[PDB]
């Protein structure tokens, strides 16, 4: 269960998800609007807000597929 900061932040990049509808552990972020521009901005925001650096090793094709993987990747730093 991620923190409010994480979810509030992630939601600013998911325009096919209303405020009144919850964010599921493994909804496809692509399906709720995350484009390749938002992915870069999102990466930047997470690094700045959590004071962490995503190494090129930990940035698989899967990292930004679902909220659950992103949060797992992030909290493991």
């Amino acid at each position: 269960m991620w923190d409010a900061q994480f979810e509030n932040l992630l939601r600013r990049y998911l325009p096919f998800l209303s405020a009144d509808q919850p964010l599921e552990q493994d909804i496809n972020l692509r399906d709720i609007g995350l484009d390749s521009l938002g992915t870069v901005e999102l990466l930047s925001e997470l690094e700045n807000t959590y004071d962490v650096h995503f190494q090129d090793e930990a940035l698989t094709k899967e990292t930004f597929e679902t909220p659950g993987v992103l949060w797992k990747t992030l909290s493991q730093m």
């Binding site: 609007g33 484009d35 521009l37 870069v40 090129d56």
Partner: protein, 506 residues
Amino acid sequence: DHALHARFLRGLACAPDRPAVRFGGRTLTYAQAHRTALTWAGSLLRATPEPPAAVGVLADKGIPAYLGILTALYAGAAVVPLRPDFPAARTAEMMRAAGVTAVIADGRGRRLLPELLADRRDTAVLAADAPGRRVAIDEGYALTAPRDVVPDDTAYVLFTSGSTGRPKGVPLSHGNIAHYFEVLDARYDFTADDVFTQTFDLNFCCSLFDLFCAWGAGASVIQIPPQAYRDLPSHLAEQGVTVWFSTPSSIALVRRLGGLAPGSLPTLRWSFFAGEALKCADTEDWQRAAPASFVENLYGPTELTVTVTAHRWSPEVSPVVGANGVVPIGPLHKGLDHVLIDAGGLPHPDTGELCVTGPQMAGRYLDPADDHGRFLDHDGRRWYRTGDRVRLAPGGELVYLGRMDAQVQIQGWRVELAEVDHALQGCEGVGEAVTVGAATDAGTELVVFYTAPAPVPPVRFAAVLRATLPDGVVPRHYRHVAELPLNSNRKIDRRALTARAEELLG
């Protein structure tokens, strides 16, 4: 010699043990790529009853895709880049239209094949890492040399937006592309020491520049991955990148995330932009970041083989030649000719729709029906009609003024508003839906106006649209209204609604 794959051979002869591709931390030399392309194309030609006219490359950007592109050319077939992330329906229509009889597919590509080949069960399938016919890959089946081709052989099939939702297919001949690279080979000074970005997705014409300016020269194309965009100086420096090509959008992105601090990009020698209006203020930040770099604006539609103009950025010239803080597109490629058609269909000396003829012109779509209104007959020659209004200066510098019609550019994505409208008829809970392009600081954004008893969740629009439209063209703005306005002749008023879109966004 006119063969696209000959450019890769020129590189191979020049720089056999140098990298041709760096991607995902892996290196592929010209020698490694050559030996694999010979094996794959040999194995493929072994498995097909006839040399296939069109080979699908259904893979994410990366080494499997680059090997797939070379394999198709080496087999003497047309390359048909396919996007595994596109909706299956769109991909199926592209494979159908292009008469694809063989697919080179990565992991993700192969998961889509059960659906895509459902009743194209014939299709040969080569794995780059029970419908379709699995190609057995063996060095024993290798071509010893690549197949030759004639100038009129289709080298590439690329799709542009269609008004009925169905995309228009553009066959580019080896001859079309050879005329393009003769102009670029003469204009630029690339060597096997150069490291080129590969930012363009392989279904887009500008990816030919990345791959075949690099490969023709013995250079390498490199992955610019999503995370590089938040520390571009470190990425360009670590990887020794010397040639940048992207859309203008990337300038604002890189500036926002890591700055474009002056002198921060010293490795760059060439900086190329195409696909959207390039702003003078953006170009100046990029020039000051990359002070050792020449900066050029490149323009052209798929139908004229990648680009047909080039303007060198100069702080002293470009704003003088250019209008409204937009960098000019530059003079027409040597060996092409233009006529400007005004809105009445009459030639004009200096202002009208840019129409182009010469060896870079495709001259047709796959489907003859798409040809109507897109070609001109004038002075005993066939010209392609860009839909782009331009002004000509003495000495031949062109300035982009806007579109004659109701096609729009969303980041780089050229899309017909009719394409989005057609897909929206499918939608539920919606009375009528109309798409407009809203002029924003960012260029143009799709906005849907729609009638209904109540607002409709964006996700419901998205669910329907993603069945037939690539995400690039799926709007993010949905406005519920009581009444859609009608014009003089009782069709919905898109002029009024474009204005209402603009005042909602800025």
